[PDB]
Amino acid sequence: SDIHELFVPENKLDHVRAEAETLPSLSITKLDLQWVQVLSEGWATPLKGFMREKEYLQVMHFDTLLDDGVINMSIPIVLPVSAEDKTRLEGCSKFVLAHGGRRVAILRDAEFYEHRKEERCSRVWGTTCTKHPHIKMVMESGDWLVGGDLQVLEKIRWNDGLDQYRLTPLELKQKCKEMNADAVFAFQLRNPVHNGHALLMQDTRRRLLERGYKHPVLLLHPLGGWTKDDDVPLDWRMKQHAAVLEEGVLDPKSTIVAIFPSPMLYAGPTEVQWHCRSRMIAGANFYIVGRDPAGMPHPETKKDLYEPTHGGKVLSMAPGLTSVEIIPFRVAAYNKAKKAMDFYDPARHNEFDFISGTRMRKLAREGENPPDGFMAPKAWKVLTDYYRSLE
Amino acid sequence: SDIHELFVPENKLDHVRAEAETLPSLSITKLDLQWVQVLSEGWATPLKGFMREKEYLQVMHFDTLLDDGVINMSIPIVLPVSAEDKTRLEGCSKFVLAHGGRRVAILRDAEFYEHRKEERCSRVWGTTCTKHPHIKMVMESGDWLVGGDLQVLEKIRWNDGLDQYRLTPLELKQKCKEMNADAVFAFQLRNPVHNGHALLMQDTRRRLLERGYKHPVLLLHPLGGWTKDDDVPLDWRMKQHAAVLEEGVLDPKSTIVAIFPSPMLYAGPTEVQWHCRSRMIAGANFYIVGRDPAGMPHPETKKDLYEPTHGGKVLSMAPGLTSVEIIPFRVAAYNKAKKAMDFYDPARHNEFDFISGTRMRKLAREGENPPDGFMAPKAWKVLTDYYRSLE
């Protein structure tokens, strides 16, 4: 239940920042900096920094963290570095990480070890398909990894108008306490919210009320780190979600909308454990699985990279998630009879019309609306503005 | 710990055999039959048969078996089937497995699930390199897997003159008991034994005696399931090991020589867990790691597929191996100062000369002998007969 943040104390920051100007420095990428944000805020509690070699091995082979207890940790959080930089910095026991001209953190007692890229991609993604857009970034990175104790100077801000939504796990716990929450149920997502998603979240709220929880709180938690090129961008998704809440499709008085700062791997059942354990750190006792969670189509062939039931099955078997209950995904679809979203029943297959993201883009392209009741009208209007902005 | 064998009771065999002639049958390969042998003898205790879907997933993602407790199980033991055979047998709750005209086992309450071959190879081997000889067998197998409860009619014999060495875990425990063993230390291997290997085993015996064990027993345990084309064949290796024992380089009075019936995957750190946990089932309290354990050169390039320290590091971190102590590998080499083998010390680098398997084959090719003290003379003569037999 403890959260291990990695920030310098407030009262020491001005002095610490002043001194770090003298240390040798290592330039990191934007993706690396998003991982520094993830580490800094305690999402990967109790990691002390970028993973050392033994931590990396245990994650890759067992999906658990080096610890006297059992802690779920299924994805590597590692910092790739060039051979040149390894040569320069090995044996330096205290150096700075910098990005965009700013010194953002100090890495202490660093160790350098081989980045065996093909093995990492095979074991984490279950493929080494070079066209996968996140695998491509790993394959292009340096041949070494550096792990160590990380101390982060201050909260990583992006200054894009969305930092107000980038809450830390501690801040989310404080917000839930202010709402007198006695159940926190989380929904991970990377797409617009339609009324089938909403139906799932409303069904979960209803089920928790019937169990006797007095104040269940929905944590609507869109991912906002690196995503692939064909996802709707984060700022447009936040506008769309805001429209859903303003329409009352989800109730603002029992919902927290916040951005989860992690890069997305699109690693299917390996990554859904990460999506779950991070919401657990933020206090969620309940986790709603999505459709094809963390999945994507195999490039070139367009067939599903992962088997669509494996995320839920693996999450149900995973070690170190004892404090969270998995809420199964339930297919919803537009019911032509009720003119409304409803849970799908194969015993009534012919009543239901499915609407995918490609369908929505094609609908906007012809200036069409989806069926009435598929999406809150102001939220649909946000999406048509997005597609229009693509000209 | 209990061993869960899968054999039909003695008193029932003649009856069950007579009945199984009427059941629908599924033809399995030689490799499959070697896995039936592994399963039947309890090496994969407490597996009940070929892995069901949820067992398979937990193995691939977590290296542990579906459990009430935590049990190490890092490799899939699965039965591939063609789509035609799946169509024929799904819903059949009791059918036989057959090979070479013999009905060898009954599979009960079978379930069929997709063989996602690329994902299996990526997660288990950390590569999908097609040319890896065991990966090629997986890639060429059927598109379905079948799991279920397996009942094996009788001990799988190969009738090649080596069945006397293929002892079950129960038989190994009984043999150790007959020797009044109070420590059993196991050495996995797939190659000839030279006097560096022997030095490691003799040093381990010495250390166990100094800890106060009165009767430590060496389990010299060559693997004898499927191996790749360029390994010395099993019958030649057993002749070579017998020569080492007859020369007294290892003491027959405190050594058990037996054949471990598992196919070899050559999957490095994933497979060394399997090599260790199987010896644990047979009662080994101590497990000596070899050099580059379960490794092989990447085909085409010929560099090491795995990082040579990872097998020992991963084994030290693995869950479910609490009752085994890992004895670290120590490099030995031919010391030119004296002439015996000796543990390598970089501080005396120039005294030592290494002798690989390629070096031994080239030595035989020119009719040359290795240095005096590298290998027992009778055992070297076995190897020169082997190399000569390939003309």
Ligand SMILES: OC[C@H]1O[C@@H](O)[C@H](O)[C@@H](O)[C@@H]1O
């Ligand atoms: O998810 C945050 C951002 O990540 C970038 O990698 C994507 O290209 C953007 O569209 C997205 O808004």
Ligand SMILES: OC[C@H]1O[C@@H](O)[C@H](O)[C@@H](O)[C@@H]1O
């Ligand atoms: O290890 C048992 C046998 O397996 C076969 O696959 C190899 O080709 C033989 O050389 C070996 O003796």
